[model samples]
Target chain A: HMDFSQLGGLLDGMKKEFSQLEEKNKDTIHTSKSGGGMVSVSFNGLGELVDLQIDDSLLEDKEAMQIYLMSALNDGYKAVEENRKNLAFNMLG
Target chain B: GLLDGMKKEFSQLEEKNKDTIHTSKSGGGMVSVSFNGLGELVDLQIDDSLLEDKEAMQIYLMSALNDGYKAVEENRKNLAFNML
Candidate 1:
């Protein structure tokens, strides 16, 4: 196991690195889609979904469907968390 | 462990900044980036007031963008450590 001090140093360095990246490309684009692929989002790197696309069938109950779409998009974003975890394991291993 | 914590922290920070951008006057903006992160400018609404103070507006928006990207970079590091 890594020492607590070493882990602390690692965390701080990670934070600084992240801060620099955020400072540099804050205006780029990020896209997401539901696992079933019914809802999609196109957002700038800022994390705002600028455009949302839903299936035509869902338009019949647009309001309710919109909520579902948004929920799915949220799940998609959460997937980012899983990916991050996977990366951590790979590096530490 | 570090990656998850960082993600949570960044998420909270993002939420805080979101409120800041929403409450600020129109034309204000923010940006976010990371070298390996694949997303950009998650949210931006240029306030009309930005027209009058373009320079300041630009700086704020740019800094926000940087913040967002940095969040992603931290995530990468966090993930790297978790693997060990």
Candidate 2:
């Protein structure tokens, strides 16, 4: 039978990190805004959407508001992804 | 205006959370997981034979989940780009 010890530690560490990934970021909020700050969005460390703020002026046009809100949310996701990459880099080194 | 806009946007989010599905599998389809656009785990399935090996099951499930969420993220990015 092949020895599994070498693989064991690596698997254990990855599992632990995966489980704790959200706990690390739940309290940290990443925010982004678009349309000259008329639309804003916030996501927690887990990249879960937390809050969204939209200006009344944008509400007059539903389509415009949707586009701006998406822009803001997308920006927030990009930030979340950066943090994810950092975590992976730290794990490797 | 706030009320109307909120209603519309909330519905849009609700629909996306339910309607969007990204499925991923690992180990030659022995493990599978699905996540919605919200990146919430919606479903999981494991091959009956693989259930006997706990560690293997765990690893494959993680692999599928990682792939699943990446798909969800890419889809979100694309949807946002399209909307713009």
Candidate 3:
């Protein structure tokens, strides 16, 4: 009832196709900021939190630091999602 | 200043996060994937034998990597919840 071979070259080469995307994913670094640059963060194509910077002024105020850090990471994850969609879409074409 | 101490704490957390690796396997150990707490894929391995069957490789790779991502996300949430 199930025949994987009928699927043809598309599925046959998908391993290479997707693997290529994985390799490509790490090249583009996405950066985001919050609290007017009080917190800055970066995520790589694989959604890895590669870089982060926080202002010294926020150290005394834990609430502000926590909020801004989360906000920046939120934006960074959005970029990771964008990369995921774009890479898959480009490959599908 | 407290700033110096906070910086050190954050740096330590960052190192610890990198060291915490999450992993998953599929197809009876035919494939495996690894991701850090940041949800970034750090490693992947697919059996060379399965690689010839591209379709099978795709299925196993996706299944394994998805599991790894889920583990990373769970750890991520746990870390945040503990902080709060």
Candidate 4:
């Protein structure tokens, strides 16, 4: 049971600025590597995927592909977490 | 004059984000009031259309305005006291 008014306030206050800053923050992609730099994902301030760089060395077989793919997503979320911290710092300033 | 420009800026921002707005049949969404330099609520508006009933609208408006008064009272108290 979610209260829509509170949800509305949260979304309304933030989403517009997020959309406005979406393009501007594209240059500052937060990069994260997983499995010792085998996989990487870059995310922007709005949590949009700007880049997905992978090392071909890890994509040898099907089993390796699955492991790297899962780890890549985990790394992507970690990048987003750092982006959120930076966003909070900017907001406080 | 500064307040007027600030008001217009806020209105422009509101218009730009109007498409993203949402309303419920129940009283939901942003309800707000703006005050003048004299602490008078010159603008009272709801960004939601679900407040259709006149009585319900009045109730929310009154409640919001009263909340504004409480905020004004706090400001007055701060001004009257010296930082010692």
lDDT of 1 by residue, A1-93 (tens): 889999799989877876665554346656677626766665554344455565655545445544554455455445544554564455445
Worst 10-residue lDDT window for candidate 2 chain A reads: A58-67
Most accurate candidate by lDDT: 2
Task: lDDT winner between 3 and 4, please give it.
Answer: 3
Q: If the candidates were sorted by their lDDT against the true structure, best first, what order would they fall in?
A: 2, 3, 4, 1
Scored by TM against the true chain B, the candidates give: 0.50, 0.70, 0.76, 0.52
Residue range B1-84, candidate 4, lDDT tens digits? 322433344355333433332222213434677654235556656755635666777777776777666554443333222110
Task: Compose the digit string of candidate 1's lDDT tens values, residues B16-79.
Answer: 4443321222222332222224332333344444334445644554454445545655554575
What DockQ was computed for model 1? 0.05
lDDT tens digits, residue span A14-59, model 3: 7688878788777878889998898777767887656666666665
Q: Candidate 3 chain B, which ten residues in sequence have the lowest lDDT sum?
A: B1-10
What is the docking quality class of candidate 2? incorrect
- Positional deviation of residue A58's Cα in model 2 after best superposition, in angstroms: 1.3
Kindly report which residue stretches of model 2 are placed more than 4 angstroms away from their true locations once superposed: A1-3, B1-84
Better of 2 and 4 by TM-score: 2
- Candidate 1 vs candidate 4: the lDDT winner is 4
TM-score of each: 0.33, 0.50, 0.50, 0.36
- For model 2, what is the C-alpha lDDT against the true structure? 0.68
Error of 3 at A31 (Å): 0.5
For each candidate, report its DockQ versus the true two-chain complex: 0.05, 0.03, 0.02, 0.04
